[PDB]
A paper describes a structure:
Titin has a molecular weight of more than 3 MDa in its longest isoform and is over 1.5 μm in length, spanning half of a sarcomeric unit from the peripheral Z-disk to the central M-band. Taking titin kinase as the N-terminal boundary of the titin M-band segment, there are another ten Ig domains towards the far C-terminus of titin, referred to as M1 to M10, encoded by at least six exons 358–363, or Mex1 to Mex6, on the respective TTN gene. To achieve this goal, we have solved the crystal structures of five titin M-band domains: M1, M3, M4, M7, and M10. In addition to the ABDE/A’CC’FG β-sheet sandwich core, all M-band domain structures comprise two characteristic tip regions, which we refer to as “N-tip” and “C-tip” due to their proximity to the N-termini and C-termini of the respective domains.
The structure of the M4 domain was determined in two different crystal forms, with one showing a trimeric M4 domain assembly and the other revealing a disulfide-mediated dimeric state. Two other M-band domains each contain a single exposed cysteine: C20 in the M4 domain (E19 in M1) located at the A’B loop at the C-tip, and C42 in the M10 domain (F42 in M1) located at the tip of the CC’ loop near the C-tip. In one of the two crystal structures of the M4 domain, we found evidence for an intermolecular disulfide bridge across a crystallographic two-fold axis. It is mediated by two exposed cysteines, both C20 from two M4 domains at the C-tip coupled with an intermolecular Zn2+-binding site with tetragonal association of D68 (D68 in M1) and H70 (T70 in M1) from the two interacting M4 domains. By contrast, for domain M4, we found an additional higher molecular peak when using size exclusion chromatography, indicating limited dimerization. Interestingly in the presence of Zn2+, which is found in the structure of the disulfide bridge-mediated M4 tandem arrangement, we detected a further increased level of M4 domain oligomerization. In correlation with our size exclusion data, SDS-PAGE analysis under reducing and non-reducing conditions revealed a covalent higher molecular weight species, indicating intermolecular disulfide bridge formation. We show that two M-band domains with exposed cysteines (M3, M4) have limited potential for disulfide bridge-mediated linkage as purified proteins, additionally supported by a structure of a disulfide bridge-mediated M4 domain dimer (M4-SS-M4’).
Numbering used by the authors: 4 to 99
The structure:
Amino acid sequence: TLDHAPRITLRMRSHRVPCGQNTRFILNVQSKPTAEVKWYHNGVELQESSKIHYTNTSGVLTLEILDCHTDDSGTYRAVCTNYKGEASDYATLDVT
Ligand SMILES: [Cl-]
Ligand SMILES: [Cl-]
Ligand SMILES: [Cl-]
Ligand SMILES: [Zn+2]
């Protein structure tokens, strides 16, 4: 298997979450070498915190947002990069 640009094979799902609950976005990327992943909320890069966690387990990418409020609604985007190229996916959160 030659090195290749990241390709997203399972895309995030736009969804709703009741105020105060935790939620996750999950996608799957195929990348060789392994992709560097960045996450964004309405265009602004997310950093890990008590509220935000993200992981990459062999290409399964998960963003977890804890204790969701109205301010957490909006567009979440993952960007996956290696020297061969990039892939990106986005979805919406609606906190109800
Ligand atoms: Cl896969
Ligand atoms: Cl990867
Ligand atoms: Cl965006
Ligand atoms: Zn709360």
